[PDB]
Write a protein that binds this ligand. Sequence first.
Ligand SMILES: Cc1cc2c3c(c1C)C(C)(C)CC=[N+]3c1c([nH]c(=O)[nH]c1=O)N2C[C@H](O)[C@H](O)[C@H](O)COP(=O)(O)O
Ligand SMILES: Cc1cc2c3c(c1C)C(C)(C)CC=[N+]3c1c([nH]c(=O)[nH]c1=O)N2C[C@H](O)[C@H](O)[C@H](O)COP(=O)(O)O
Ligand SMILES: O=C(O)/C=C/c1c(F)c(F)c(F)c(F)c1F
Ligand SMILES: O=C(O)/C=C/c1c(F)c(F)c(F)c(F)c1F
Ligand SMILES: [K+]
Ligand SMILES: [K+]
Ligand SMILES: [K+]
Ligand SMILES: [K+]
Ligand SMILES: [Mn+2]
Ligand SMILES: [Mn+2]
Lengths: 500, 500
Amino acid sequence: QPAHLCFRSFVEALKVDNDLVEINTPIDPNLEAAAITRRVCETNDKAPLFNNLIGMKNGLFRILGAPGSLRKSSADRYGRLARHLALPPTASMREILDKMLSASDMPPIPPTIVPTGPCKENSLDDSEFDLTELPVPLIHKSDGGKYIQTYGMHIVQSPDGTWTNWSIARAMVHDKNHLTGLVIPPQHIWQIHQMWKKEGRSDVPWALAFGVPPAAIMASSMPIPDGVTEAGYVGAMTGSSLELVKCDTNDLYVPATSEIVLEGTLSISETGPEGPFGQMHGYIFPGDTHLGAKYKVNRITYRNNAIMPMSSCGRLTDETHTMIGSLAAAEIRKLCQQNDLPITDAFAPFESQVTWVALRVDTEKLRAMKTTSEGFRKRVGDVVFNHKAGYTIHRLVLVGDDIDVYEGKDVLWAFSTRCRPGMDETLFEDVRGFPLIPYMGHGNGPAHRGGKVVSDALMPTEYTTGRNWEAADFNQSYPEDLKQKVLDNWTKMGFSHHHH
Amino acid sequence: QPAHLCFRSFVEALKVDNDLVEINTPIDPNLEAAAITRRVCETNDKAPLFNNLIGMKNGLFRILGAPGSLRKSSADRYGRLARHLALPPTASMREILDKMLSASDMPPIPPTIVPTGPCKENSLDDSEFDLTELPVPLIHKSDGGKYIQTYGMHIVQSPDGTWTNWSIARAMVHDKNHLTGLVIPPQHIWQIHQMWKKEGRSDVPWALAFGVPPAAIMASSMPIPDGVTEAGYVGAMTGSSLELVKCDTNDLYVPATSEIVLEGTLSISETGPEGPFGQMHGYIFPGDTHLGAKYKVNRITYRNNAIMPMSSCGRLTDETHTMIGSLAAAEIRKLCQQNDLPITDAFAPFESQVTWVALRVDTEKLRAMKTTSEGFRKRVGDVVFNHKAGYTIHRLVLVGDDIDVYEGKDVLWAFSTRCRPGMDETLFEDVRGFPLIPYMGHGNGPAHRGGKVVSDALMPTEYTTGRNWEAADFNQSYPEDLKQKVLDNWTKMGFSHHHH
Ligand SMILES: Cc1cc2c3c(c1C)C(C)(C)CC=[N+]3c1c([nH]c(=O)[nH]c1=O)N2C[C@H](O)[C@H](O)[C@H](O)COP(=O)(O)O
Ligand SMILES: Cc1cc2c3c(c1C)C(C)(C)CC=[N+]3c1c([nH]c(=O)[nH]c1=O)N2C[C@H](O)[C@H](O)[C@H](O)COP(=O)(O)O
Ligand SMILES: O=C(O)/C=C/c1c(F)c(F)c(F)c(F)c1F
Ligand SMILES: O=C(O)/C=C/c1c(F)c(F)c(F)c(F)c1F
Ligand SMILES: [K+]
Ligand SMILES: [K+]
Ligand SMILES: [K+]
Ligand SMILES: [K+]
Ligand SMILES: [Mn+2]
Ligand SMILES: [Mn+2]
């Protein structure tokens, strides 16, 4: 099966790419596998595959760390991501994000039901597993539990059957047959949970699938619209209907080639201790346990020699930056265009710990609007900060056409030199805030409200007559024939490769 | 003579360091020398020495570009700066800035007058030079003149004789015997000019010395206090009295080993067109000419085979970032400590285009103050933004003891994750602003007032009981013995030098 449609094939692809290190000697799931993965993420090294995990029994389980993290070379920096999507490994971020948005104006391709698949090779009933006996990792030394769920997909369906959501939300082991996890507004797993709680009759039928088709895990990390079934979006994006098998103990459907599947229920009444967890902004607050949602596990099914993917998340750079930030930015680009705002590109700079999004403006279009900074900032912030796609983002930076928003140095240059603090900004206190940013949930104000800003790094003439400067740089401050002469004589004169 | 006391010896030191490229074939001062230097600055390459400059006659002049710019390796990144100060080439920024501050609590060592020096080897009177016939560079394609003065020292004295100031301010050729340049408040050349204009009797006696002792050009770029003679500060810093010779046509004194000296007057009545100039924030606004101060040149003296240093300034990284930003930050550190604020370190991040300064706080001391963010931000911003040392800086970022302010990635991480926009900030509109930042002089508000902010990236418990988090990073989220095991087995397992 192709790499973007089968996790097992994705792991092969990483090997073939010389982007995997297979570790066949014993590695401890208590901190060691995650420490190695953390180091990989902080250094952009090859992804680790732990084939000999202390505590693995009867096939459960090997671990792949850093599945969506960065490569060291600039030429294939985003290659792991490209390998989730059948794109060449040299694909740009623009190309990855356009691929993720492409299904937004396509008919869905609904999934195909098949009678069996690899995820049925092995099964354990409710008398035969114990989640405390599996090699679940402790990912950070102060975590409040062993976080089994950092790169699987939760599957829940609306009571009426009309919407099946796929999403990533963290969860940890509570006891032999339960997990606890984050289920918070405005996320779709929370929106669906609320529909079942209002009906009041039963717990939510649930599955959690690990090692799913890579194209599916990418859509699971993206804020596609309310009511849109991720499976049909992924089918349109890839051009193929995804093959799904029914769960054994409920009527949900999971990818046929899933590595590991948990089946059970998400309670509409019970909670249990959850967290703390080392998280995407780079922090853990030891001891900050709170009550989370509670999942009951009734059945495990799994592939022979099953592989569990894991995100060792925290400081730069991991899946919580490359996927959460970039895919939110993609959705925000589209949302702005659909609201008739002249936005061409959007990206969440890594330097901002993916808390900012830079919005590149088509300034010819802006000029024809005959507007001002105060008016335009308000319009952009009202659109984005009132929408779910803006949930995680606390600062929007508006920049003109000379800025490449995919280059954090250029975004920081424009922000620092073109946006006057205070006067060129609009603060938004009556919007939903993201409580997991430290300055929100552990800060001086309301954890769930406000703390957002639009910072206008457009210069005044960009609204009127056009850019009135040139950069004081090699590219813009010297004519073409001189530049070329310099470059052609560079190594001649004594001064100092793209792939590497 | 030692490198820090003689520019000619400094050039040798760069050679010996394998940090110079000598270019002995003809190079055009019209853009080509500056384009090569720009490229060097954007790539951290070796400094260029142009020995065959088109238009050089009778010894005037060779050019050294990038005298204070960065080296490519991390281990000697600041080595050019270290070579201005007799420090080892591996000196840290902390060590460089401490050396620059060391004379602040020392008695001055006043200069020594000697009867002659190398700067007297050649002379041209007022019938024998023409500034339009020298190989003065055009540094950026849109500049409003040929900027002779980008790395010399202006010398002016108070009318009462009690203060002799040395400083860098830009100047360009106006005609055969005049320059125009920037002379703006609150700079010491402007403060002295105003004392002569209030007296009303004559133009200001002036000299401009190029290729001065490197330790002297560093103090020329630093905002040491009002009324302090830079020569005696440099003498205390170096432990030696600087040797000076009298000008021929006035009673000012110039370094004996200066490469080139202009003698004349700075008018108290005349102005002439000045600018535009590609400047330290990375911009030029073509056509933005304004009236500047006007200098008359009566005499040129110079060394045999004289060398003119040049800064090809603009986008990162050059002397306007490494010297202006860092030396302002040093002075701000000291100013905060003298006002009893618990600041340990200060640096202007390059990523901010040296418009921010990050202030590291001794949080044990802060806790004993028993204060709040609102109160402490106001106190820090009142001290810094009301003082000349804060002139160029528009955002202060307060950070706790875990942050290395000399590392821009860590400053950006703390700012983005610990400072809630709006609530955790105090805006300052009734302070002097720096008009050369684009969002000031070319922006939406008053060019000369406001636009400043203190952003508090201290977390709430840093004011009360102490840091309550651990980083989600390799260093802090794993025990020491595990970390060491990982590192010792790194290359064994399959994964990937300090000097490089
Ligand atoms: C890539 C990724 C996405 C995580 C994520 C992680 C990763 C690796 C973890 C597991 C390592 C850390 C926690 N995560 C959570 C999370 N969203 C949230 O609600 N709870 C989370 O606990 N997300 C973000 C979430 O997947 C996106 O917001 C989706 O848009 C949610 O899908 P939905 O739009 O269908 O609700
Ligand atoms: C290193 C450096 C410093 C420049 C500088 C440049 C460089 C290379 C240039 C020449 C390339 C671009 C312009 N510069 C000017 C400047 N200060 C200012 O008043 N006018 C300027 O035109 N400065 C900053 C100035 O030297 C510092 O603010 C000093 O503190 C001034 O000394 P003072 O405290 O004695 O007034
Ligand atoms: O990093 C974490 O533990 C939890 C992340 C989280 C979340 F709770 C959300 F609601 C999000 F929308 C999101 F993008 C997240 F990443
Ligand atoms: O970059 C330029 O042309 C002029 C810089 C300049 C200045 F005018 C000042 F007043 C300063 F204080 C300063 F630090 C500067 F760099
Ligand atoms: K999703
Ligand atoms: K602006
Ligand atoms: K000075
Ligand atoms: K704060
Ligand atoms: Mn969804
Ligand atoms: Mn001074």
